[PDB]
Amino acid sequence: GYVPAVVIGTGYGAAVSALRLGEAGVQTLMLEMGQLWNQPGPDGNIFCGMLNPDKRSSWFKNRTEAPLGSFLWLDVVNRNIDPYAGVLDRVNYDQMSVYVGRGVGGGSLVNGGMAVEPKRSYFEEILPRVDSSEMYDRYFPRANSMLRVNHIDTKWFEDTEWYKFARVSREQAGKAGLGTVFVPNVYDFGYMQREAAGEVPKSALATEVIYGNNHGKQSLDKTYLAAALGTGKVTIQTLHQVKTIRQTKDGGYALTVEQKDTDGKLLATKEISCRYLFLGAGSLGSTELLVRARDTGTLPNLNSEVGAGWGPNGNIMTARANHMWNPTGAHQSSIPALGIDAWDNSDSSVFAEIAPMPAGLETWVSLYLAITKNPQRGTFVYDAATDRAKLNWTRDQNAPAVNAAKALFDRINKANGTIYRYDLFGTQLKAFADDFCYNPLGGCVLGKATDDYGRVAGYKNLYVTDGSLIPGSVGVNPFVTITALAERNVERIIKQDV
Numbered sequence: 001g002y003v004p005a006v007v008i009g010t011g012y013g014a015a016v017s018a019l020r021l022g023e024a025g026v027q028t029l030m031l032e033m034g035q036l037w038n039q040p041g042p043d044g045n046i047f048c049g050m051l052n053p054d055k056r057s058s059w060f061k062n063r064t065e066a067p068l069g070s071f072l073w074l075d076v077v078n079r080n081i082d083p084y085a086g087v088l089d090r091v092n093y094d095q096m097s098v099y100v101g102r103g104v105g106g107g108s109l110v111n112g113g114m115a116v117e118p119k120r121s122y123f124e125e126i127l128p129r130v131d132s133s134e135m136y137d138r139y140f141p142r143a144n145s146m147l148r149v150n151h152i153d154t155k156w157f158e159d160t161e162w163y164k165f166a167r168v169s170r171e172q173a174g175k176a177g178l179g180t181v182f183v184p185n186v187y188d189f190g191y192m193q194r195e196a197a198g199e200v201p202k203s204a205l206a207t208e209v210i211y212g213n214n215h216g217k218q219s220l221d222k223t224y225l226a227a228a229l230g231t232g233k234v235t236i237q238t239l240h241q242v243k244t245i246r247q248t249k250d251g252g253y254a255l256t257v258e259q260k261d262t263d264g265k266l267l268a269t270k271e272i273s274c275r276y277l278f279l280g281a282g283s284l285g286s287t288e289l290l291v292r293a294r295d296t297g298t299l300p301n302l303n304s305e306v307g308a309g310w311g312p313n314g315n316i317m318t319a320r321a322n323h324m325w326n327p328t329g330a331h332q333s334s335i336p337a338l339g340i341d342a343w344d345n346s347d348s349s350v351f352a353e354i355a356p357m358p359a360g361l362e363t364w365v366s367l368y369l370a371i372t373k374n375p376q377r378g379t380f381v382y383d384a385a386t387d388r389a390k391l392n393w394t395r396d397q398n399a400p401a402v403n404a405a406k407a408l409f410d411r412i413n414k415a416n417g418t419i420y421r422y423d424l425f426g427t428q429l430k431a432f433a434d435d436f437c438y439n440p441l442g443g444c445v446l447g448k449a450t451d452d453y454g455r456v457a458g459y460k461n462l463y464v465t466d467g468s469l470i471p472g473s474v475g476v477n478p479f480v481t482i483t484a485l486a487e488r489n490v491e492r493i494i495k496q497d498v
């Protein structure tokens with residue numbers, strides 16, 4: 001029942017923690033509620049594609065859903081499914097739906113692979129207590145190297161039909177006096193070229209991404225976690241969900257864990273104790289464990305900052321209708337490679353990525369995922385009745401995000417004489433999706449609910465290492481920042497505490 005160190009979750013913060021602990025010679029156990037994705041399914045593949053979703057695509061749902069923005073074309077392939085330990089979980093709150101990955105590797109399994117560093121000037125604004133020099137000189141470079149971040153061949157990008165959709169938006173943006181930037185990725189671009197040449201089995205060019213990539217994507221299980229297991233000091237137990245955390249009489253920690261099968265049946269409830277406890281259950285997961293512990297009295301010394309400071313990273317999705325003479329192409333790579341940088345740290349800041357359309361036919365639609373600067377924050381509150389943490393966030397709190405995104409795209413529309421599509425996000429005629437979130441951040445903010453290195457306030461040997469540490473916004477896709485911050489924190493923790 002005892003293990004020196006226990007890491008909850010296997011996402012970015014958790015993976016960095018497990019590797020460094022293993023290298024320091026600390027016996028570590030990682031607990032993951034999802035599955036280890038290494039078993040071929042009914043089709044011979046591990047993951048299902050976006051055009052053939054099945055039970056593997058969803059975390060205990062009774063029917064598959066079309067990826068946001070492609071309902072008009074992909075709802076036709078949706079089918080009823082048996083509740084299963086799928087890879088993608090759509091967590092629905094009152095006025096917000098948060099998407100998160102479930103399994104060994106966490107969000108790295110289902111994300112777009114976009115590895116971007118935030119602007120130093122913005123980083124300094126959101127975390128004034130952290131030394132930006134150490135981060136940019138040592139930690140960010142370490143993260144990029146370990147994550148196996150790479151750059152796309154610009155010549156291939158210009159000629160390939162698979163990125164026609166990106167070139168069209170670049171041209172449209174240019175007229176509005178806007179510039180584009182190449183976004184690094186963890187998907188092997190060299191492998192992507194070989195897919196286009198039909199030399200290797202396709203994944204990114206076979207409409208795969210959101211439910212996992214059977215090839216090419218360097219998810220955490222291939223990078224950090226592979227290295228962690230390679231130390232001989234790390235072990236990962238799957239289909240194990242941590243329910244409660246408490247402090248033993250002597251200062252150690254004890255956890256109640258439920259082991260279930262892929263169908264959701266409770267196999268057993270275990271008790272695991274440890275000396276060092278690292279939380280890497282994500283912005284939603286870590287926060288819920290902590291608010292529950294504080295409010296049910298198992299960790300009564302947690303401060304009032306626990307549960308506060310949540311933000312969706314200003315996530316807003318919109319789409320523009322192209323002129324008949326500007327086709328986006330039927331063949332679009334599932335991995336984004338270009339972005340529009342309009343981030344100046346002001347209230348109108350927008351960092352938008354040019355997103356592909358999985359339709360498989362010409363739609364003339366240009367899809368965008370914008371990241372804006374919206375000061376509004378939500379708060380996680382514990383509901384003792386249902387034993388669940390609820391997110392206090394209203395749709396109107398995303399108005400500043402919508403306003404900023406609208407201002408940028410109105411410019412592009414004006415310069416090109418185009419209009420928005422208002423029929424892509426379900427019912428209503430909405431041009432902007434304002435109630436979804438791919439980047440949940442906050443809930444246990446660094447320096448507020450914890451010290452400047454993630455040591456949870458009020459306790460010793462209790463650490464948070466994930467997206468819950470970030471103050472609701474980073475200005476770009478978050479995983480590189482989560483990884484770099486984890487590197488900074490765990491290094492200090494190993495030196496001082498372990």
Ligand SMILES: Cc1cc2nc3c(=O)[nH]c(=O)nc-3n(C[C@H](O)[C@H](O)[C@H](O)COP(=O)(O)OP(=O)(O)OC[C@H]3O[C@@H](n4cnc5c(N)ncnc54)[C@H](O)[C@@H]3O)c2cc1C
Nearest residue numbers: 009011012013033106107112113114242285466467477479
């Ligand atoms: C569709 C999609 C697209 C995105 N694209 C990008 C992109 O291209 N670039 C980018 O930078 N970011 C992207 N993101 C966001 C990025 O994936 C997340 O920011 C990142 O994965 C968060 O890391 P984390 O370490 O905080 O936690 P997560 O990676 O979310 O994982 C935490 C882990 O904890 C497990 N866990 C949760 N609670 C428990 C519990 N009680 N017991 C045991 N295990 C538990 C979860 O199952 C999970 O595996 C995207 C995400 C989505 C959903």
